[PDB]
Amino acid sequence: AEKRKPIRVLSLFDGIATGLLVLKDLGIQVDRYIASEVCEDSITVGMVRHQGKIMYVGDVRSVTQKHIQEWGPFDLVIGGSPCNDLSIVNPARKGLYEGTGRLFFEFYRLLHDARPKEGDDRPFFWLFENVVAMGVSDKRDISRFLESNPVMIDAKEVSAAHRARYFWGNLPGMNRPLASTVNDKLELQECLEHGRIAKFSKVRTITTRSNSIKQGKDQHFPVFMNEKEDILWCTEMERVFGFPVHYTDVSNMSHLARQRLLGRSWSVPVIRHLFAPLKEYFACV
Amino acid sequence: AEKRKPIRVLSLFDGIATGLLVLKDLGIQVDRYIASEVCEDSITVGMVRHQGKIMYVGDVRSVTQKHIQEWGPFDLVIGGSPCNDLSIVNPARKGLYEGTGRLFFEFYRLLHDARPKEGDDRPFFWLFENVVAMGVSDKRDISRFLESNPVMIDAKEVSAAHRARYFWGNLPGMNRPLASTVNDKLELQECLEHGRIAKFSKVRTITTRSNSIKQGKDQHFPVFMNEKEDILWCTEMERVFGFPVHYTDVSNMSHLARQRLLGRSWSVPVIRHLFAPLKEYFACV
Amino acid sequence: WRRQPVRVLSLFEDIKKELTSLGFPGQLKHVVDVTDTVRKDVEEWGPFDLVYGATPPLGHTCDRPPSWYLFQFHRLLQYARPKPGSPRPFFWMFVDNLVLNKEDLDVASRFLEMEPVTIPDVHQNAVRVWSNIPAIRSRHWALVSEEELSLLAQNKQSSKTKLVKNCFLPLREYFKYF
Amino acid sequence: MFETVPVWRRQPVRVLSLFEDIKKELTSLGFLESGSQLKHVVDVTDTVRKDVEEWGPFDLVYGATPPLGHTCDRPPSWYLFQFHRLLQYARPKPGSPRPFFWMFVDNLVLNKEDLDVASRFLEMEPVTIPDVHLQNAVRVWSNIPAIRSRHWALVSEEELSLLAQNKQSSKKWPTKLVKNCFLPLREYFKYFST
DNA sequence: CATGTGATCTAATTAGATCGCATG
DNA sequence: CATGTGATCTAATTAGATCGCATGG
Ligand SMILES: Nc1ncnc2c1ncn2[C@@H]1O[C@H](CSCC[C@H](N)C(=O)O)[C@@H](O)[C@H]1O
Ligand SMILES: Nc1ncnc2c1ncn2[C@@H]1O[C@H](CSCC[C@H](N)C(=O)O)[C@@H](O)[C@H]1O
């Protein structure tokens, strides 16, 4: 019979602030949201959609141990480092130790910096996400530096898109079975605007690239409107990813810039499933 | 007593269906809303934003007296013909009798076709809009063909932008003073997203062209964001025009394609001021 | 028998020289230019039984675009119509001297709700007419291709009517003779 | 923890070395005796945390990048990340009061970007070591106080640039430069000798 | 005499087809 | 026997400057 506290979160590679979006969707009170992000479009979405709650600190490599101690303590450390040098979709990927790959170790470093000293049993939770389609030795090393094996959660069972992602962390019930809640839209048709017909029940994985919205090797169009073929609109991608509609409609972004943000982000119901047991550890309503 | 009936509308050059939007916001029941428009983006907006209520009939020159007879009768005939060959902002304007200017006479023709016979006293209302910044002789001829002088209503009095427009028609109280409702956003600051500062109370007239977003002849940016000068975003234009936010976030349209639609449209509060007395003539929710 | 004299309003063109060659305080009213003519003007000019308007020939002294004459024609044609209770006949005549182009021709047939009958003469030029008179649409005439007249019009531009009287004649059966 | 202990209360140092066996240097200064205390690890890619702990406690963790040559089956930053990983595995529990030292040595194998990483992951900038009678140079990161208070002949990175240049061209480790960095630790552990 | 339901021109910047092969 | 939090090229936009002058304030 003790009263829990609002959560303090350090979010690295914050993107379009999916983490804060879900924490609010769960009723978890948030005392501090410190985000390291470098993309100005990303930052603008977070700043606007969360009304200046997020505190931005810039490049993850500008964040020292001294900063962690001043800004902390933290109860939650989350992030997913860039995968453009890890994913096997890229034939020119520079790997875990080069290019953007090595930005993973900045997560490892700040996580070490943010951990409670042994003997301190205060609640501390962390989550790290990346792609399944990476080299076997890069998944080996990531698990070696995090000292955990990951959980494979495919967004297909709670959304309208395939998205097989790895999840390292210590959140409670991380491997419990996923369950399609009634606020998930499991089929593409339920994500489309009025007057449009889905040609597929579920779309393949949506990257930052336009060829990922067309289906298969034959590049099939996903939707019929007026008996004419068409690709997904931005608002349909947002629903496929679980975001509120028009979430990314900021900053005069083109539809490709919006897809750039969405294609790097997390599937919202997947995270919501992962963050859900946190509301038993922190203040709510 | 005799109960009033839902309104039946012929909408020429419907654009993004401002007319149906304002009628719905007034509570006026709409039995049918037949719209003449050729631009695919415009039709897509109206189709999506009004769930297929709108009856699209194509080019205004394909609409015959026979059609008016079959589809009618109509209680309301509205439209505003293209102005690119009328407004003195185009040094190459081809005038009222050529280019797109001659599409005005199509409004004059379908209006005649839809008017009740003499002896028929059924309620019939019509409204024609165009820009103030046209030639003396062209404005003279429009009033000759519609047999009425226009009323000048500037949107600056009920919104955050200068938009001086002429309005020909027979609606009750077209010359009554304009009052600001509390739903009007009078200053630019009230239309901006979080974190952004307005440099002007009112902005100049917004056209389809980007130079109309920057102010003065010196092309001043209208907004500050974290001390950086910026132009208005799409959602901010929508609020400046009085539309719902993300109204035009349809069809993967770029900000310039969204600005093409908005810069040709009507100021929503102005139309609401013009349509409000129709509530006493037709059925309402 | 009881056929009162004709009442003709003519626009852009005074046809009196072939109006009394046809033999019909003048009944014919002629408007200077129509840009400031309104309804009360046409109304107080008394009732009319035929309203006439035409395009100038290919040549100068025109300060107006070719479709200006038509719209203005159409405008005052409606000003002159009588109420449905009026039993008297009513005819109207628009007629082009091959100045309208293909885009301007479709505007003509759409605003006048019928397509033109063509009038040729070779021995000069050719002419198209829109009118409700059942003696120019229904009376069978020499058929000329649209591109025949196209080529004759190019030959007319290179180079620089009794058929305008031949079309006015058949109204004599409804009005007074000579 | 820059304090010393009396000579009679000093135990033999236990040393974990990675990517390099430094047994010869430390016995040559009498940190080890010639009996059959130092663990050198093969391939750290699969050494977990329990492994480092089961290898007994360590008072010093040493890591080095291989010298200018063609031994790099791995990228030059791999050795530094791996060193930092196993270094945290080998730190003592916050209770322990005994002296704990670490050291990472670079032989001009890391370029400007990899070096900024090194100084960021070890929270200190390296110290350059010049070999005059100029033949070689090393950069060193360590918590050893006398390598942060004594100052050898400071040379600019553009000078190391050029020798880095001459070291590429002519292509073992310069132990003469390495040996002096262990000098101030015999004031902390037990001495031995022939 | 400041203004404008637009249009042209052309760098500098994005859109979209094809390209990968390790891995699950 | 597919598949992909990508990238490289092309043609395709846009970003922005610039032009324009009749008009009624
Ligand atoms: N050096 C750096 N410091 C901080 N963030 C960086 C960075 N380099 C890349 N990033 C950001 O890391 C992000 C990884 S993609 C992950 C975004 C997040 N999962 C979401 O839901 O939106 C990208 O947004 C990229 O802009
Ligand atoms: N031939 C034609 N037939 C019907 N509509 C046409 C047309 N030519 C142009 N248009 C349309 O006429 C419109 C004039 S702009 C007026 C838009 C409307 N008032 C709104 O509030 O949105 C444009 O949308 C243009 O696409």
Author numbering:
A (entry chain A), B (entry chain D): 628 to 912
C (entry chain C): 185 to 208, 215 to 313, 318 to 354, 361 to 378
D (entry chain B): 178 to 213, 217 to 313, 317 to 354, 358 to 380
Task: Quote the study's own text.
To understand how the R882H mutation of DNMT3A affects its structure and function, we determined the crystal structure of the complex between the DNMT3AR882H–DNMT3L tetramer and CGA DNA (DNMT3AR882H–CGA), containing the same sequence as that for the DNMT3AWT–CGA complex, and SAH at 2.5 Å resolution. Structural alignment of the entire DNMT3AR882H-CGA complex with the DNMT3AWT–CGA complex gives an RMSD of 0.29 Å over 875 aligned Cα atoms, suggesting that the R882H mutation does not alter the structural integrity of the DNMT3A–DNMT3L tetramer. The most notable structural difference between the DNMT3AWT–CGA and DNMT3AR882H–CGA complexes lies in the DNA conformation: In comparison with the DNMT3AWT–CGA complex, the central segment of the DNMT3AR882H-bound DNA molecule bends away by ~2 Å from the RD interface in the DNMT3AR882H–CGA complex. The protein–DNA contact at the RD interface of DNMT3AR882H in the CGA DNA complex is mainly mediated by residues S881, H882, and L883, which form hydrogen bonds and/or van der Waals contacts with the DNA backbone. The fact that the DNMT3AR882H–CGA complex was crystalized under acidic condition (pH 4.2) likely contributed to the H882-mediated hydrogen-bonding interaction. In addition, the side chain of R887 is poised for electrostatic interaction with the backbone phosphate of A15/A10′. Together, these interactions lead to a buried surface area of 238 Å2 in this region, lower than that for the DNMT3AWT–CGA complex, suggesting that the R882H mutation leads to reduced protein–DNA contact at the RD interface. The TRD loop in the DNMT3AR882H–CGA complex adopts a similar conformation to that in the DNMT3AWT–CGA complex, with residue N838 engaging a base-specific hydrogen-bonding interaction with G6, and R836 forming hydrogen bonds with the +2 (T8) and +3 (G9′) flanking bases. Furthermore, as with the DNMT3AWT–CGA complex, the hydrogen bond between the side chain of R882 and the backbone carbonyl of S837 is also abrogated in the DNMT3AR882H–CGA complex.
Mammalian DNA methylation is established by de novo DNA methyltransferases DNMT3A and DNMT3B4, and subsequently subjected to maintenance by DNA methyltransferase DNMT1 in a replication-dependent manner. DNMT3A-mediated DNA methylation is further regulated by DNMT3-like protein (DNMT3L) during gametogenesis and embryogenesis. Among these, mutation of DNMT3A has been identified in ~25% acute myeloid leukemia (AML) patients, which gives rise to aberrant DNA methylation patterns and increased cell proliferation, and correlates with poor clinical outcome. To gain further insights into the context-dependent DNA methylation by DNMT3A and the mutational effect of R882H, we determined the crystal structure of wild-type DNMT3A (DNMT3AWT)–DNMT3L tetramer in complex with a CGA motif-containing DNA, as well as R882H-mutated DNMT3A (DNMT3AR882H)–DNMT3L tetramer in complex with CGA- and CGT-containing DNAs.
